[PDB]
Structures are given as structure tokens and as C-alpha cells.
């Protein structure tokens, strides 16, 4: 008797005292104090205030600078848009519901907010995967006579939308479901109840394999091969101080990206390990929901790492912010 079941929701709190209410109808102040809901709002506010400008500005300087509109950069614009889906589909709604202490948009808004917030995070995830694949193809040259062009980059972007719909759409049509999660102010995939009617167990496994294990393998293989190729070529040109510098910075960037991906990936894996083993006990509004709580900041640090640390983007944004000069 861990929580309180109901149609379209699972409140992680026991109703033996009779105080539990539907997360669509009344505040959930038995899960957390009102000030903790306010701090949830403050965190959404921080994410909006940092996440909208960085991601919008990425779209804005691309319009003003012709050099940024290369095919290899299409996937980065895709990343900016996906983060905007997280900011408006997810962070903005949650700021508003947070301050009511419950999900005031009803089960319909739950499917909407859950879809768009999940879509945004999924497009982002597969953008990092596709970018790693593209860089691997361009550097390691695994195809004899291949040249990465505009059409290939469009396939890459379309591929992320297909993968993102593959995760976000089934819960609308019967495989798993969207329900309020954690403090019940935002909606997501249901990893919290085994709903035999929506086959939740098979979807969690599909999510864990296809959208969690595979992305890590692809990112590690592609970037490992790339660093191997770059270090090999530099070894044959040790007379060039610049080639060695380029090799060092490529390696240091790949480390940063992989470390950043792990910082978002490992908390989910640690929670899994605490579900596999330690399966008995319940889990409060801090389920899990802790990996979700911190993965949200990827809408801020991913554009910082993949765009603001890009050599050309930075100069173009300085020029744009500096009213044309500098
Ligand atoms: C967690 O657990 C709590 C406690 O069990 C649940 O809250 C109860 O929910 C039930 C509904 O299933 C509520 O029952 C309904 O109460 C209505 C109001 O009752 C108060 O007001 C009347 C005056 O109208 C007073 O006389 C009375 O003493 C109460 O204080 C009634 O209108 C309802 O009556 C109708 O339905 C019943 C059958 O359920 C019929 O017998 C009646 O004839 C009539 O048709 C009904 O009694 C109950 O009040 C809630 N209790 C509390 C403390 O809130 C939560 O639902 C549960 N949480 C979740 C998420 O499931
Ligand atoms: C982009 C989002 C939509 C996507 C996402 O939301 N999830 C990814 C898969 C996830 C959590 C949900 O991880 C799990 C670990 C263990 C179990 C079984 C144990 C159980 O949770 O019951 C289920 C799991 O589902 C995600 C993917 C990649 C990363 Cl890096 C971050 C998030
Ligand atoms: C830098 C670390 C910040 C930790 C903030 C902890 C704040 C705890 O603050 C306490 O929380 C209680 C919760 O019921 C309130 O009832 C108390 O009034 C409040 O003092
Ligand atoms: C930009 C953010 C806008 C936040 C608007 C929050 C409006 C909260 O609205 C409040 O919700 C309570 C329920 O918890 C009601 O009891 C109050 O009557 C109501 O004022
Ligand atoms: C390094 C990979 C970056 C992608 C980060 C995506 C973070 C998505 O985070 C997910 O968002 C969903 C909707 O808010 C929630 O329902 C999930 O519980 C949460 O883990
Ligand atoms: C996802 C794949 C990430 C690969 C990161 C490889 C980091 C290697 O690190 C490098 O190792 C060399 C020795 O082999 C040292 O000589 C270099 O100084 C060091 O930068
Ligand atoms: C150090 C702080 C850890 C907080 C762990 C998360 C506890 C609440 O869980 C949160 O509920 C919110 C409202 O539904 C969701 O938007 C978040 O994704 C979820 O993390
Ligand atoms: C060129 O690069 C500089 C042009 C003029 C911009 C200088 C002002 C930047 C201030 C940004 C910081 C605002 C912080 C607001 C805190 C809420």
C-alpha cells in the first residue's frame, strides 16, 4: 500500500488517513510543503530564464550568419528547437501547475504536456546521437566514396523525429500512458504502476533498451572511434604543433561531451539498479523523479557545450549581441 491509485493517476502517498486527493483536482500538500512547491517553481523559473535565451539565440544568430548554415549544423539547430519544446511544453506548464500545487489542466492537458515535454527530451537525446554518428562518418570515413551533404543532414534530423515519436506517441494510443509524476505537477511516461491494460512493463523494457542503452552505445562507439582516428593521424604528423593542438582539443571536447551525457545518463541507471535490487520498498515523490529533476538542466548545459563552445557560434553571438560590432 505505497500510494493511492485512481483513474489516470498514481499519487505516491498512502490514503489510510483519507487526505489524498486527485492530482487533477486539489493541491498535493501532503507530498510536500507549499514552500517546496515554490522551490519547484523557482527551479522551473531558473530553467526558463536560462533555457529560452540560449536556445532561441542559437536560432537567431543562425539567421544572421551565413557561415553557420552548414549541413553538419542542422542537427544542432534541431537540438535548439527540442530544448524549446522542453522549455515551453514542460518547464512553463510546470511553473504554472507548481504554484497551484497540482496538475490543473486535467487528464487532457496531462497527455499534451506529457507528449510535448517527452518529445522535446527525446529529440534532444537523438540529436546528440545523430551528431555523434555524423561526426564519426565525416572523420572516420567508414564509407569508401561518401560525402556528407544537405540531404544526409535532413535525413538525420528526420530520424530524430521518427525516434522521438516512437517513444512519445504510444502512450497516447494504448502502450503505456501519461500520468502526473513525482509531486504531480507535470506529466510523463508511467514507470510507477504496472498497468496491465496498457502493457507498461514491455514499454519500460523497450524504453530501457532502445532509448537508453542504445544511445549510450552509439555515442561511445562513434566518439571512441573518432578519438582513435584523430590520435592515429596526429601520431603520423608529430612535426605539426597545430595538428597536435587540434588533436588535444578534439579529445578534450569529446571527453566533455561524453562526461556531460553520463551526468544525465547515470542517475537513471543508478535508480534502475536500485529498482532491480532493492525492489521491495516503496518510493516517495523522490522516486526516481530525481534523475528527471536533474536531466531538465540539459536544456541549458547541452547548448552551452555543443553550441556556445563551438568556435564560430561564439563569435557570431558576440557580434549579434554587440549590435554588429566586435
Ligand atoms: C482517499 O480517501 C478518502 C477517504 O475515504 C476519499 O475521500 C472520500 O471520498 C468519498 C467519495 O468516494 C466521499 O464520499 C462522498 O461524500 C460526499 C460529501 O460528504 C460530506 O458532506 C455531506 C453533506 O452532503 C455530509 O453529510 C457528510 O458527513 C460528509 O462530510 C457525499 O455527497 C457522497 O454521498 C454520495 O455518495 C455515497 C456513496 O459513496 C452515497 O452513499 C450517498 O447517498 C451519496 O450518493 C459521498 O459520501 C468522502 O466524503 C471523502 N472523504 C473525505 C474525508 O474527503 C478520497 O477519495 C481518497 N482519495 C483518492 C485519490 O481516492
Ligand atoms: C528523453 C527521455 C524521454 C528519456 C526518459 O525519460 N527515460 C529513459 C529510460 C528510463 C527513464 C525514462 O531509464 C530507465 C532506467 C530503468 C528502467 C527500469 C526500472 C524502472 O524505471 O521502473 C526504466 C527506465 O526508463 C531519457 C533517455 C535517455 C536519457 Cl540519458 C534520459 C532520459
Ligand atoms: C543550503 C541548504 C538549504 C536547505 C534548506 C532546508 C530548509 C528547511 O527549512 C525548514 O523546513 C521545514 C519543512 O516543514 C519548515 O517547516 C520549517 O519552517 C523550515 O525552517
Ligand atoms: C506566472 C505564474 C502564474 C502563477 C499563477 C498561480 C495561481 C494560483 O492560484 C491559486 O491556487 C490555489 C490552489 O492551490 C487557490 O486556492 C487560490 O484561490 C488561487 O489564487
Ligand atoms: C543527454 C541526453 C539529454 C536529453 C535529456 C532529456 C531529459 C528528459 O527527462 C525526462 O522528461 C520527461 C518529461 O518531462 C519525464 O517524464 C521523465 O521522467 C524524465 O526523465
Ligand atoms: C568516448 C571515448 C572517449 C575517449 C577518451 C580518451 C582519452 C584519452 O586520453 C589521452 O590518453 C593518452 C594515452 O592513451 C594520453 O597520452 C593523452 O595525454 C590523453 O589525453
Ligand atoms: C534535490 C532535489 C531532488 C528532487 C527530486 C524530485 C522530487 C519531485 O519530483 C519532481 O516532480 C515534479 C512535479 O511533477 C516533476 O516536474 C519533476 O520531473 C520531478 O523530478
Ligand atoms: C557585446 O558582446 C556586448 C553588447 C552589450 C551587452 C552587454 C550587456 C550584457 C548584460 C547581460 C547580463 C544580464 C543579466 C540579467 C540578470 C537577470
DSSP notation for 172-216: HHTSS-EEEETTTTEEEE--SS--GGGTHHHHHHHHHIIIIIHHH
d(C-alpha 307, C-alpha 326), whole Å = 19
Q: Is 247 annotated as a binding residue?
A: no
* Minimum-distance ligand 1 atom for the alpha carbon of 11: 60
Q: Is 244 annotated as a binding residue?
A: no
Residues 183-219: b if buried by 16+ CB within 10 A, e if exposed = bbbbbbbbbbeebeebebeebbebbeeebbeebbebb
Cα dihedral sign for 140, 143, 144, 147? Answer: negative
Domain that residue 184 falls in:
1-326
Q: Is 118 in the pocket of ligand 1 (CB under 6 A)?
A: no
What is the number of the ligand closest to the CA of 324? 8
- The count of other CB atoms within 10 Å of the CB of residue 35 is 9
∠ CA 91-55-61, nearest 5°, is 160
H helix intervals, the chain: 34-64, 71-85, 93-100, 106-140, 150-168, 170-173, 200-208, 214-235, 241-276, 290-295, 298-303, 311-321
Residue closest to 307 by CA, chosen among 129, 80, 153, 121 = 80
Give the pairing type, strands 186-189 and 178-181. Answer: antiparallel
Kind and range of the H or E run holding 11: strand 9-11
Q: What's the total number of domains in the chain?
A: 1
d(C-alpha 181, C-alpha 296), whole Å = 14
Angle between helices 106-140 and 93-100 (to 10 degrees): 140
Residue closest to 49 by CA, chosen among 302, 306, 299, 264 = 299
- CATH (domain of 179): 1.20.1070.10
Confirm if 87 and 52 have CB atoms less than 8 A apart: yes
DSSP conformational letter for 67: G
d(C-alpha 296, C-alpha 43), whole Å = 10
This PDB structure is determined at a resolution in Å of 2.5
How far does the centroid of ligand 8 lie from the alpha carbon of residue 322, in Å? 9
d(C-alpha 183, C-alpha 203), whole Å = 23
- Atom 10, ligand 7: which residue's CA is nearest? 182
d(C-alpha 190, C-alpha 193), whole Å = 7
Residue closest to 254 by CA, chosen among 224, 217, 285 = 224
Confirm if 277 and 307 have CB atoms less than 8 A apart: no
* Minimum-distance ligand 7 atom for the alpha carbon of 290: 5
The residue behind cell 486535467 is 106
Rg value, the chain, Cα: 22
Confirm if 191 and 288 have CB atoms less than 8 A apart: yes
The residue behind cell 593521424 is 233
Angle between helices 214-235 and 106-140 (to 10 degrees): 20
Amino acid at each position: 500500500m505505497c500510494g493511492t491509485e485512481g483513474p489516470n493517476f498514481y499519487v505516491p502517498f498512502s490514503n489510510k488517513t483519507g487526505v489524498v486527493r486527485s492530482p487533477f483536482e486539489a493541491p498535493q500538500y501532503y507530498l510536500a510543503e507549499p514552500w517546496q512547491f515554490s522551490m519547484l517553481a523557482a527551479y522551473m523559473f531558473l530553467l526558463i530564464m536560462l533555457g529560452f535565451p540560449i536556445n532561441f539565440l542559437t536560432l537567431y544568430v543562425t539567421v544572421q550568419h551565413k557561415k553557420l548554415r552548414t549541413p553538419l549544423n542542422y542537427i544542432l539547430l534541431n537540438l535548439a528547437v527540442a530544448d524549446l519544446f522542453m522549455v515551453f511544453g514542460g518547464f512553463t506548464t510546470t511553473l504554472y501547475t507548481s504554484l497551484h500545487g497540482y496538475f490543473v489542466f486535467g487528464p487532457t492537458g496531462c497527455n499534451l504536456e506529457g507528449f510535448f515535454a517527452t518529445l522535446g527530451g527525446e529529440i534532444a537525446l537523438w540529436s546528440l546521437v545523430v551528431l555523434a554518428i555524423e561526426r564519426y562518418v565525416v572523420v572516420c570515413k567508414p564509407m569508401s566514396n561518401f560525402r556528407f551533404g544537405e540531404n544526409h543532414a535532413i535525413m538525420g534530423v528526420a530520424f530524430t523525429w521518427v525516434m522521438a515519436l516512437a517513444c512519445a506517441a504510444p502512450p497516447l494510443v494504448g502502450w503505456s500512458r501519461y500520468i502526473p509524476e513525482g509531486m504531480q505537477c507535470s506529466c510523463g511516461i508511467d514507470y510507477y504502476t504496472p498497468h496491465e491494460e496498457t502493457n507498461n512493463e514491455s514499454f519500460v523494457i523497450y524504453m530501457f533498451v532502445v532509448h537508453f542503452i542504445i544511445p549510450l552505445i552509439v555515442i561511445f562507439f562513434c566518439y571512441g572511434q573518432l578519438v582513435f582516428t584523430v590520435k592515429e593521424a596526429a601520431a603520423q604528423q608529430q612535426e605539426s604543433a597545430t595538428t597536435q593542438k587540434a588533436e588535444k582539443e578534439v579529445t578534450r571536447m569529446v571527453i566533455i561531451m561524453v562526461i556531460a551525457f553520463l551526468i544525465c545518463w547515470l542517475p537513471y541507471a543508478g535508480v534502475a539498479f536500485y529498482i532491480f535490487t532493492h525492489q521491495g520498498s516503496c518510493f516517495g515523490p523522490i522516486f526516481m523523479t530525481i534523475p528527471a529533476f536533474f536531466a531538465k538542466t540539459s536544456a541549458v548545459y547541452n547548448p552551452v557545450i555543443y553550441i556556445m563552445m563551438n568556435k564560430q557560434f561564439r563569435n557570431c553571438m558576440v557580434t549579434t549581441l554587440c549590435c554588429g560590432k566586435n
